[PDB]
Amino acid sequence: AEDAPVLSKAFVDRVNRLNRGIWKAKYDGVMQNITLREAKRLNGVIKSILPKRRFTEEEARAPLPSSFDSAEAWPNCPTIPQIADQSACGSCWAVAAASAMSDRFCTMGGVQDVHISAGDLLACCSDCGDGCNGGDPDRAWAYFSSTGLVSDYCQPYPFPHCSHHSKSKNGYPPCSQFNFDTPKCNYTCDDPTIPVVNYRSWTSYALQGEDDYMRELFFRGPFEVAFDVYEDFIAYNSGVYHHVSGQYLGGHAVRLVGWGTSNGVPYWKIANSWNTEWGMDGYFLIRRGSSECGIEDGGSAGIPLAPNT
Ligand SMILES: *[C@@H]1O[C@H](CO)[C@@H](O[C@@H]2O[C@H](CO)[C@@H](O[C@@H]3O[C@H](CO)[C@@H](O)[C@H](O)[C@@H]3O)[C@H](O)[C@H]2NC(C)=O)[C@H](O)[C@H]1NC(C)=O
Ligand SMILES: *[C@@H]1O[C@H](CO)[C@@H](O[C@@H]2O[C@H](CO)[C@@H](O)[C@H](O)[C@H]2NC(C)=O)[C@H](O)[C@H]1NC(C)=O
């Protein structure tokens, strides 16, 4: 809506009084100068058709640890620690997917280092949404089993690393000066002399509640989730997030990768779609069990299909 910057010095102070110190907020962080309208732009979740995940007896009964990190469970996969950046778009719905989809061709797909093309997804799946104006994860994963996608090497993500800092700590260009539209849907690699390879999943499903999450994450690896972004989330720096003050900004899609506790506080470790500069090095930690901002209300995942025989 407005061009009014979202972060106040007073706003933040308030927030830091109400969180009890549980999680640090920052007013002069990487996000102070950010526009109200620029913020809602990053929240790409708009609008289950997916079968709910049924756990086998064997899975259902397994004693899940108090702490679990996906990058540790599968040390041999480089796609897990890698943080994504959706630039200046509502790509989160798509980015968050390809991310988990890349991660899952490992944990399950038998291919180690394959970055699924979030751009390809973002531009060709039409029932998913309006592209860079909002999307629906459930369908993202459906199109992965339905149509299938291409590697990042074939069809790279078209928007550059964008920073919300006048002077970036990694020297990216500022976000303020970007306004991206849904790219064109292409059917050959951006370099036509690169053969087009198609990666589909052979099934997709949906997750709900605290336990489905851990249990599915444990066996199959990171997947896609969404939650409500309030103004306080923007000023997130560290510690375990939970909503205390702020206007609604929209549903935002992220990638789940772990869980633990911090001083008696159960949390989810989540990989974000905004830089390595934001939060805990692109990461952030929300509150497990509350279902904070609805983060446990709906998940999305699938099993990738190993290429060839
Ligand atoms: C599908 O392939 C086409 C191949 O060009 C891609 O469209 C092009 O995307 C590039 C990179 O985002 C755009 O570059 C921009 O060009 C303008 C000049 O018009 C400039 O202002 C920017 O600084 C930037 O260099 C380009 O405009 C755009 N061209 C067309 C015809 O759409 C598209 O991104 C590919 N889509 C996917 C999903 O891979
Ligand atoms: C937000 O904007 C402020 C000021 O509008 C920026 O602070 C200035 O940074 C410039 C370099 O870009 C310095 O020369 C000045 O020392 C600062 N001036 C003032 C008045 O603060 C700041 O870079 C921006 N903040 C972030 C986090 O990007």
Numbering used by the authors: 26 to 72, 78 to 339
Give the text the authors published on this PDB structure.
By combining diffraction data from 80 Trypanosoma brucei procathepsin B crystals with an average volume of 9 µm3, a complete data set to 3.0 Å resolution has been assembled. Diffraction experiments were conducted on the P14 microfocus beamline at the PETRA III storage ring (DESY, Hamburg) with a 4 × 5 µm (FWHM) microfocus beam, a total photon flux of 1.2 × 1012 photons s−1 at the sample position and a photon energy of 10.00 keV. To collect a complete data set, we employed a data-collection strategy in which a region of interest of 600 × 600 µm was raster scanned with rotation exposures. This final set of reflection intensities included data from 426 diffraction patterns collected from 80 individual TbCatB crystals in 120 groups. During stepwise model building and refinement, 62 propeptide residues and five carbohydrate residues were manually placed in difference electron-density maps. Main-chain deviations of more than 0.8 Å are limited to nine residues located at the N-terminus and C-­terminus, in flexible loop regions and at positions flanking the disordered part of the propeptide region that results from an increased flexibility of the residues after proteolytic cleavage between Ser78 and Ile79. Despite the overall similarity in atomic coordinates, systematic differences were observed in the relative heights of the electron-density peaks at the 12 Cys SG atoms involved in disulfide bridges.
This enzyme is of scientific and medical interest, since the knockout of its encoding gene has been shown to be lethal to the parasite that causes sleeping sickness in Africa, which turns TbCatB into an urgently required potential new drug target. TbCatB crystals grew spontaneously within living baculovirus-infected insect cells during protein overexpression to a size of 10–15 µm in the longest dimension.
